[PDB]
């Protein structure tokens, strides 16, 4: 019977209560104070141009109807009471397929303070669009937004804001960082309104600032490109008579380089513009292709089929000697320009 007092209170709150009418309809504007505790920043999906994020989505708003006076100053209730009272219809403007967790019971807490204030937290895994510009890819940094506002209620109907200072209202747990290639820097929040034919709606924008970690694409892509770049010039070191040796060297290098170019592309969605890797791969494609033309030039002047034996014999080609030094030097200066260009 001790719980009967709390059951009796909950009956008085819901009777004569309308889930369709927002708090203070007409008489007042509804002010919703929202907070986010990002429990885990899910893996950014560059292929889908979206990102996953697992959050506790707190929302607080004053509702005069849900006012009580009992032994407990605050009622901690399960999700089942949330569906029977008005809650903001908050939706994520850039939100793709998103799932509200349900295991074991619905992961939503309702908490009604005696004054009337509510706290309505829910656990979500929202996949939101994060449009990306990949000119600097792989050494690119993005600011993925997460906009959320009411769907049916215009700026004069419900207005959102941050419970704490705006700086301290999006909290990311240190333990939870599920990013692999990206790295979270910080979170910046801003408020605005969005113009719609249906009306003017308030938005709560928050930008999660990310940065790619170049470490993966170094060993995965840049090093194999560099080895193929290195492998191409080894044919300069090999003697000129060994036509099959250098030929097999050069043709192998281009085919390997071509495979790397295709390999890099599938890591990213199709895009009209060429990323930074595409320029590194392209110029790497030039050195490997240029090396073959150097060998082809040597074959033009490789008059004597017979090699040197320890009559005339083939001398080491002048182009071969100069290609020995110029090519590694020309590639080295390029790396300094390339790496300095994008890293800084």
């Amino acid at each position: 019977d001790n719980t009967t007092v709390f059951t009796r209170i909950l009956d008085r709150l819901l009777d004569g209560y309308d889930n369709r009418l927002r708090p203070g309809l007409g008489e007042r504007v509804t002010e919703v104070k929202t907070d986010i505790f990002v429990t885990s920043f899910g893996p950014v999906s560059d292929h889908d141009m979206e990102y996953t994020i697992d959050v506790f989505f707190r929302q607080s708003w004053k509702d005069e109807r849900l006012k009580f006076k009992g032994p407990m100053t605050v009622l901690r209730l399960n999700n089942l009471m949330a569906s029977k009272i008005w809650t903001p219809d908050t939706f994520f403007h850039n939100g793709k397929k998103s799932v509200a967790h349900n295991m074991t019971m619905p992961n939503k807490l309702l908490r009604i303070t005696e004054d009337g204030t509510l706290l309505y937290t829910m656990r979500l895994t929202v996949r939101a669009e994060c449009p990306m510009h990949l000119e600097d890819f792989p050494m690119d940094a993005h600011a993925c937004p997460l906009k959320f506002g009411s769907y049916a209620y215009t700026r004069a109907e419900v207005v959102y804001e941050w419970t704490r200072e705006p700086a301290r209202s999006v909290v990311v747990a240190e333990d939870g960082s599920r990013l692999n290639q990206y790295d979270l820097l910080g979170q910046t929040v801003d408020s605005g309104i969005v113009q719609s034919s249906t009306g003017e709606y308030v938005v709560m924008t928050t930008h999660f600032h990310l940065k790619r970690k170049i470490g993966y694409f170094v060993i995965q892509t840049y090093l194999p490109c560099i080895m193929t770049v290195i492998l191409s010039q080894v044919s300069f070191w090999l003697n000129r008579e060994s036509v099959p040796a250098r030929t097999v060297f050069g043709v192998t290098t281009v085919l390997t380089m071509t495979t790397l170019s295709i390999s890099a592309r599938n890591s990213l969605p199709k895009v009209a513009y060429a990323t930074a890797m595409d320029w590194f791969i392209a110029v790497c494609y030039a050195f490997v292709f240029s090396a073959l033309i150097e060998f082809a030039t040597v074959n033009y002047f490789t008059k004597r089929g017979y090699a040197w034996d320890g009559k005339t014999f083939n001398s080491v080609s002048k182009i071969d000697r100069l290609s020995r030094i110029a090519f590694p030097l020309l590639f080295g200066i390029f790396n300094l320009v390339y790496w300095a260009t994008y890293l800084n």
Partner: antibody
Framework: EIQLQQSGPELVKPGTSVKVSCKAS????????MYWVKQSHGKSLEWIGYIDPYNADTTYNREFKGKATLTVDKSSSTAFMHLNSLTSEDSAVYYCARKRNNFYFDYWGQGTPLTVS | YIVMTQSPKSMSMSLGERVTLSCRAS??????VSWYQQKPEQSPKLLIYGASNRYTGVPDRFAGSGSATDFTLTITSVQAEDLADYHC????????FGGGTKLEI
């Protein structure tokens, strides 16, 4: 008609403690935080602290941490600031303000000049 | 905290004409920069809440344009009551106000 009326002007010698009371009239007191701002003559406005009247939680400026103590009396709808170890640097004008949004300090107090000798 | 600085410490201009006040923020503040007016022996009066929006009851001559860090308050036509000492606050983090620009003929 919102009107934040702070206490009258006073001046006490160094080493004493002084309390100034900020009184809210129109709006509901507990809904919005109450801030405290210090301004020396010919100087910028400096934040002291804010107190959420309902939970009575307080957050203080690092410089004024310990120097200033904020307490509230919801029954009278009055916010109190307590100062201790008064010095020459504490001679200034102490304002009271509310925060209606993350954007602006809607209504300010009348001001409460403080000087020491 | 975030440091707010106002470029023109004192601006001189007669009645009418255009007068623009600047206010830079040390780091990001979004659209949360407010502007306040304090004539001497008086409390501050809010003018431009948010980067651009104008508070109710303010004359329409007051206009403000904001960016990530650089913010401005411009008066299209100056009037006798317009001359005052202005302050630009921030609220994206714990509050911190600017040095305070002053106007006189």
């Amino acid at each position: 008609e919102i009107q934040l009326q702070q206490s009258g002007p006073e001046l006490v010698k160094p080493g004493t403690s002084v309390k100034v009371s900020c009184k809210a009239s129109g709006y509901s007191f507990t809904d919005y935080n109450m801030y405290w701002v210090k301004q020396s003559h010919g100087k910028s406005l400096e934040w002291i602290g804010y107190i959420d009247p309902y939970n009575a939680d307080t957050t203080y400026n690092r410089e004024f941490k310990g120097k200033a103590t904020l307490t509230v009396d919801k029954s009278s709808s009055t916010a109190f600031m307590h100062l201790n170890s008064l010095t020459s640097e504490d001679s200034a004008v102490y304002y009271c303000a509310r925060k209606r949004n993350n954007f602006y300090f809607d209504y300010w107090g009348q001001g409460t000049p403080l000087t020491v000798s | 905290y975030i440091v707010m600085t106002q470029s023109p410490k004192s601006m001189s201009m007669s009645l009418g004409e255009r007068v623009t006040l600047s206010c830079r923020a040390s780091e990001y503040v979004g659209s949360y920069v407010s502007w306040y007016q304090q004539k001497p022996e008086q409390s501050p009066k809010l003018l431009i809440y948010g980067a651009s929006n104008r508070y109710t009851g303010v004359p329409d001559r007051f206009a403000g344009s904001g960016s990530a860090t650089d913010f401005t308050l411009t008066i299209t036509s100056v009037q006798a009551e317009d001359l005052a000492d202005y302050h630009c606050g921030q609220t994206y983090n714990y509050p911190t106000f600017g040095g305070g620009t002053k106007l006189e003929i």
